[PDB]
Design a binder for this molecule. Structure first.
Ligand SMILES: O=S(=O)(O)C[C@H]1O[C@H](O)[C@H](O)[C@@H](O)[C@@H]1O
Length: 384
């Protein structure tokens, strides 16, 4: 059989390729081909909606974001792993991949947002990693003043109208102790929503973040930090491999911290991560399941942690000696993953994402005020 697997371009398809070569080498008569979609999750989702809506049978295995199971379950777009127990996997992912009793997908890898920081620069100015956005502003000012570097950004975060801007919006909202869904219903704290949009705007206005932060996607943050142009970056675990790689200016100059809190708030972060679904329209159900069981296996989890800084779905791999030798900070990441806040679980998540990310982007592009943004977001969300 020739299986086709849709892989996020953001999640190291060349490294997944090394795992698939080990699979082929030990599975005579099976070949795997990677189709590589957009960097961002909302573009991958728009593409999969069209091929899955059209019942297209070319894809066998789908790498899907943690926010996807509700949609994919309700639409019947994946083959359930009937009577599968997800107890080997972090409960947050066991839970994300179960919808009305159905195991929609096997966890592929974990993720959460961290604060990447230039540990060389904080050391140089004697600064402690910031625990509040206010400490991060103060640290940014001190470093940018001393560095006399017209290309050094204080903070890079995602302001482009992408899935990651949803995460941007919720970080200060969650930090204030608010939720967007309470007892299944939309629970919109106006004041917390406005304060989140003004916080992100304040980084641009205060000269800590670049004027065109509204054009910055997740991987732009990764590229600019890697290039030595960013003191503080909001990003995901995959960025670490690029930072420590052959094409980086910041080898051994990167610290990892929990995201700062809003003043008086909690250091909350966004749950990310991905899972492997078998397409309901695969003509190779059995062979695809065998591939997903290998790709969701502890040995592959471990390989992808070491080679791609993708956080394990297996709790035991966080303290594995080879994992922690390659990426020391993984030894302390699991509590961040297991307490990370989840975006709303809903089959209509795409419409939820569209509303929040366009509002964030509009405010950061100076199209609307934070105040109007919050009002627009609430109105649009109310009817979705
Ligand atoms: O970069 S983005 O696609 O806009 C946002 C995504 O980032 C990371 O890949 C996470 O693992 C995903 O959960 C998240 O949705």
């Amino acid at each position: 059989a020739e299986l086709k697997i849709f892989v996020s371009s953001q999640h190291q398809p060349d490294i997944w390729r090394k795992a698939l070569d080990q699979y082929e080498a030990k599975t005579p008569g099976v070949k795997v081909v990677i189709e590589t979609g957009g960097n961002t999750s909302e573009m991958q989702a728009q593409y999969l909606n069209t091929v899955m809506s059209a019942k297209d049978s070319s894809l066998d295995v789908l790498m899907l974001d943690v926010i996807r199971p509700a949609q994919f379950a309700t639409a019947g777009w994946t083959s359930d792993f009937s009577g599968k127990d997800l107890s080997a996997y972090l409960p947050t992912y066991a839970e994300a991949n179960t919808v009305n009793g159905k195991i929609v997908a096997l966890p592929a890898f974990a993720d959460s947002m961290f604060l990447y920081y230039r540990k060389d620069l904080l050391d140089k100015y004697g600064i402690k990693p910031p625990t509040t956005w206010d400490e991060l502003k103060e640290a940014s000012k001190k470093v940018m003043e001393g560095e006399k570097n017209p290309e050094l950004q204080g903070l890079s975060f995602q302001g482009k109208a992408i899935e990651g801007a949803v995460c941007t919006f919720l970080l200060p909202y969650w930090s204030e102790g608010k939720s967007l869904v309470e007892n299944g219903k939309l629970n919109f704290d106006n004041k917390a929503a406005v304060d989140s949009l003004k916080l992100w705007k304040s980084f641009v206005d205060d000269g800590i973040s670049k004027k065109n932060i509204s054009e910055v996607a997740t991987d732009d943050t990764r590229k600019e930090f890697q290039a030595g142009k960013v003191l503080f970056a909001v990003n995901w675990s995959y960025a670490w491999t690029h930072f420590q790689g052959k094409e980086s200016q910041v080898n051994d100059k990167v610290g990892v911290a929990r995201l700062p809190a809003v003043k008086g708030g909690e250091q909350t972060t966004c749950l990310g991560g991905w899972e492997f679904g078998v397409s309901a329209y695969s003509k190779q159900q059995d062979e695809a399941k065998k591939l997903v069981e290998y790709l969701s296996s502890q040995d592959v989890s471990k390989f992808m942690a070491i080679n791609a800084a993708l956080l394990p779905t297996y709790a035991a791999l966080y303290k594995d000696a080879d994992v922690t030798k390659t990426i020391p900070w993984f030894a302390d990441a699991l509590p961040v993953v297991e307490t990370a806040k989840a975006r709303p679980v809903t089959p209509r998540y795409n419409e939820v994402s569209e509303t929040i990310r366009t509002t964030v982007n509009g405010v950061l592009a100076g199209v609307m005020t934070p105040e109007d943004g919050a009002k627009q977001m609430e109105s649009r969300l109310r009817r979705v």
